[PDB]
Design a protein around this ligand. Sequence first.
Ligand SMILES: *C/C=C1/C(=C/c2[nH]c(/C=C3[NH+]=C(/C=C4/NC(=O)C(C=C)=C4C)C(C)=C\3CCC(=O)O)c(CCC(=O)O)c2C)NC(=O)[C@H]1C
Ligand SMILES: *C/C=C1/C(=C/c2[nH]c(/C=C3[NH+]=C(/C=C4/NC(=O)C(C=C)=C4C)C(C)=C\3CCC(=O)O)c(CCC(=O)O)c2C)NC(=O)[C@H]1C
Lengths: 487, 483
Amino acid sequence: SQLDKDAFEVLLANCADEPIQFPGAIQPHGLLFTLKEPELTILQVSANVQSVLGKVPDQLAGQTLDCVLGAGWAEVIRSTSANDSLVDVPRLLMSVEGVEFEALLHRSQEALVLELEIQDKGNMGRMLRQLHAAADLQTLYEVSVREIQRMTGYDRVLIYRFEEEGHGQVIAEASAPAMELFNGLFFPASDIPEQARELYRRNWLRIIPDANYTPVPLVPQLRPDTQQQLDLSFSTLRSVSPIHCQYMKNMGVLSSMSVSLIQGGKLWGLISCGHRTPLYVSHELRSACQAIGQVLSLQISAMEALEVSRQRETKIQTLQQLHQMMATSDTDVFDGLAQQPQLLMDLVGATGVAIIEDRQTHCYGNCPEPSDIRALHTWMMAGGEPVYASHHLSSVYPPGEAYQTLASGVLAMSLPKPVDNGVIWFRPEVKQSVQWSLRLQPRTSFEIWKVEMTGIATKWSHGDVFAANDLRRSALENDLARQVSKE
Amino acid sequence: QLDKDAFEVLLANCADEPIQFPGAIQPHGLLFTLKEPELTILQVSANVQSVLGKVPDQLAGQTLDCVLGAGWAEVIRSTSANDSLVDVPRLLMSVEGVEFEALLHRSQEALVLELEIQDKGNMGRMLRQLHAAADLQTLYEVSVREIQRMTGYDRVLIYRFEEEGHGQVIAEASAPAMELFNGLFFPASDIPEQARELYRRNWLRIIPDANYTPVPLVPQLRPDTQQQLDLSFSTLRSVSPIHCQYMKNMGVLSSMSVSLIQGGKLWGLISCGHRTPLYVSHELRSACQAIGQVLSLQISAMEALEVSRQRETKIQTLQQLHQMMATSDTDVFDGLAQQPQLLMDLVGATGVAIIEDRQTHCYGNCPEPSDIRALHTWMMAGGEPVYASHHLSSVYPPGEAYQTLASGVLAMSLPKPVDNGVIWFRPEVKQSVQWSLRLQPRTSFEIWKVEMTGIATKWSHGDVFAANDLRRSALENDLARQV
Ligand SMILES: *C/C=C1/C(=C/c2[nH]c(/C=C3[NH+]=C(/C=C4/NC(=O)C(C=C)=C4C)C(C)=C\3CCC(=O)O)c(CCC(=O)O)c2C)NC(=O)[C@H]1C
Ligand SMILES: *C/C=C1/C(=C/c2[nH]c(/C=C3[NH+]=C(/C=C4/NC(=O)C(C=C)=C4C)C(C)=C\3CCC(=O)O)c(CCC(=O)O)c2C)NC(=O)[C@H]1C
């Protein structure tokens, strides 16, 4: 397939803007019918109508819904399709021509999308009990992944967390014995395109029962009512892009089932379940996984909130100690800050605390050569404000590349005293605290992350900047009186 | 006559009743306590003859095989070996015909086994429903409606514990032809502290019949330790007759309470009352426990967001007010005096009181400028730049003159010998609540009214933050305009 490889390589270059929401084909484990809400006439049909029902698709475009689905169920789907929210709808199991079909309903731009999924072949209280029993966030991730693996029966279960600029991190992983391990792996934001992220934000479950699937087209590809393509954003039977199918092939997973974790409308992460054999997931399993996803999304938000509030709680305690730390014979407040560096390091969070004063420089922790530090302090005038924050110093100050491991994100405060002053913080690179062991591959994904996240340190959160601007006022209140009170 | 007097004497010790050590259990099951190494019947319940029809006198210390049979004894011996009695599946058995569900726990180095009687998919839908809720009141209404539908209880109420442990019926769904309780604040004395500790320890409390005769635990003292068995973690525990009388006077004969615990603190309760006795199966109890846990997680989620959401809008109006004073230099708070609502909404208030000498400037609630002088004259004894009041009727002896107008007063006054001051008010909680013999919801409301006489809602930690965040702003901005 030399021609196909060239055609595929075209998709690889143009993958950040492919029309995922408008594939024009569905996965072949069911049927899709687009209908009209008032009369329920078959507006669009799938190519499997002859495969599972044995009806020629040419005579379906427009004609009666009774023709293929039977008049018996037509009234049922009319009644369940009456003017309603359709948000909460009970299960609707059917059987036409001896084929078991589960009917799911939604609406897309004044159309009734009917998804006839094919059918082949108590513990909840326990799962929520264990989820509540978790103490810390890492324990919560571990127990959640273990429980999802146990109940689903999926070979691999992974929790991706989207940290910064869309980059991902595999936090918790449980896998079947003797199979590839992914933990501490960081993948770039380019791996998941933005359209896929929007769909994951608008859908709880994404099921790909078989990567070796041939897409079946929707005939006709154009809806006569609007003369466009179907928006399959909310359809469970939506074709997967060949790029992700190749990615799953290279991984070794043939069936996937992703559960989205949404906090405050933002995609916190994903729960990805992979199988080495094509696995078909029943409705009960889907509902249980959705329930665990929502419960964990609620719980994760709570655990960080307690931890975020805890950091604020131990912040003001840290400043209070520091606000009185210079109570004894301080030549400068900074020289009083030189007694115990770890209080400064723990105030804002950084491996390097350096305060330059008295024609010399005082640094504790991960710091560069002192001569170049004043050159970084020579850049203080460029800020124009005591506060300074950066998650990437190389991009904003070009000669700050010699020290990327020691100083990638620098927090600073400088009192307006013109002679010699300023406080400097040093946070190391993210690349120096990450450990893990073809184009579309997890190993290749890690290398792109190490080049995309170059010289980038973890962003100083609003609390750290608040704890930074706080000492700006505290040092200004005290330092001037210290010299004045001597006189 | 004699029995009625014994009831009143019991009402004296309702505050410090030994609930954890009743010495009897509800008659809808059996209780045994056993030694872990041997599994011998250390202490038994009096209702053995009721179901098993066996003498109890030769059971204190004997082997379990004579009561529960050899096979079931071995099964529970294997179950109790090292399972830690946490996350243990259902263990239904049947001795002498009667089916018993065997729940297990351990108390002070003893193995308590409860044989509860056996009389007579939607969870995902309810979790989706609770996630779909947008506001807090919508969340409470949805939770109560779904809980009532799933459990089939005539009354389902959610109590929120506010201020000094007082109660508030936040949401309520009830069957027709039943008294309505909404906004019915009740005192903290209605639920004693021991009951609150037990509700914190146990998710579920089930009283299937208020008209029950307790079965005593014989012998009443464990020979191993010579004390009363602690039933603080057992579903089969006798309830105090005070609560039984309260439930009879309410008009409920069966109760099913799920405790909402946020961060180890009893946020509230989900009380399910029935007009007739009712028994809840294990599946129903597990489902209600799961919904309670989900709602406890979700209440904290929306509470935390609104705590932060109020902080973002606190700074938003904070910048606007501290940049306004640049327009007017006649008074340091003249710009503060142009938008009174931007001052009331800054911290939560129904009246702004900013006044210097020879001036009277208060918008909204204000008793009298002459009393405002006396209101401004309180600070001689308690003098700080930021002063707050949770109950002004106590700290200020003439706090009862204006309680509906100013019950909790938050005050900032910059340090200047010349007259100054910024003060905001807050009215009574008792003047914003409305609702329609000794142990009765009607009586409970009038006790709360007396117990809250001039008590305003506590100034939040973010509320005193906006008081100190306006301490620095008015301090620095004053000199530049004067200069
Ligand atoms: C520009 C196009 C590309 C692309 C497309 C693409 N990816 C997904 C889904 C993915 N891909 C993931 C990639 C990974 N990177 C890693 O390091 C690891 C290892 C653990 C993985 C799996 C990934 C995590 C997802 C999300 C899956 C989930 O759990 O939901 C899609 C969406 C497909 C769809 O139809 O929904 C697309 C279009 N992948 C590329 O690699 C680049 C070239
Ligand atoms: C000092 C003794 C008293 C007391 C004891 C008592 N009460 C409970 C449980 C209660 N009582 C509640 C009271 C209410 N107040 C109201 O306004 C309303 C109506 C809306 C009610 C129902 C109340 C809410 C509870 C908790 C219910 C639950 O089961 O969770 C107990 C606990 C009993 C036990 O064994 O668990 C005790 C000991 N009640 C009094 O009135 C005072 C005199």
